[PDB]
Amino acid sequence: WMDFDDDIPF
Amino acid sequence: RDITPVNDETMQEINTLLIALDKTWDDDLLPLCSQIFRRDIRASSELTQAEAVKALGFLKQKAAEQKVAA
C-alpha cells in the first residue's frame, strides 16, 4: 500500500 | 483503532498548509486520503484524528521540502 510515509507527489 | 474524529485544531493546521500549497480538499487531499485509507471519504470532517495526523505530517513534508512554484 501507498501510504503517507511514502514519497507521493501532491 | 481509535476512531475519534479529527479535532478543529488539527483541521485548522491542515487547512493552513493546503492554502500555502495551493491545494484543496476536493481536488487533492480527499481523493488521496480515500486511496491511502482505502475508504470513501467525502468531507474533511469525516477523517479520524489518527488519519488527519498522518495527512498533516505529509503536508508538512510537502511545505518544507521546496518553494511553491508560481
Side-chain angles (χ1 to χ4, degrees), chain B residues 2-66 68-70:
Chain B
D2 188 341
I3 56 172
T4 297
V6 57
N7 56 50
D8 290 336
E9 313 95 84
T10 303
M11 181 59 53
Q12 186 153 344
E13 285 190 69
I14 289 172
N15 286 341
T16 300
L17 289 173
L18 284 174
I19 295 162
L21 292 167
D22 192 23
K23 304 276 166 183
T24 67
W25 286 108
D26 283 348
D27 303 300
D28 302 292
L29 189 52
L30 285 176
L32 187 57
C33 287
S34 290
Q35 287 173 303
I36 294 182
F37 303 128
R38 301 180 293 279
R39 83 198 182 66
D40 200 343
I41 309 165
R42 290 179 177 105
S44 62
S45 52
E46 297 174 17
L47 286 186
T48 76
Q49 180 62 15
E51 288 171 335
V53 160
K54 292 166 184 163
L56 175 59
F58 172 79
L59 294 171
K60 288 181 161 177
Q61 178 67 45
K62 293 307 171 197
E65 268 171 355
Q66 64 182 287
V68 176

Side-chain angles (χ1 to χ4, degrees), chain A, chain B residues 32-33 35-36 58 61-62 65:
Chain A
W1 311 103
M2 204 184 6
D3 71 12
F4 273 123
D5 280 344
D6 296 313
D7 186 12
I8 310 164
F10 185 55
Chain B
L32 187 57
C33 287
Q35 287 173 303
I36 294 182
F58 172 79
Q61 178 67 45
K62 293 307 171 197
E65 268 171 355

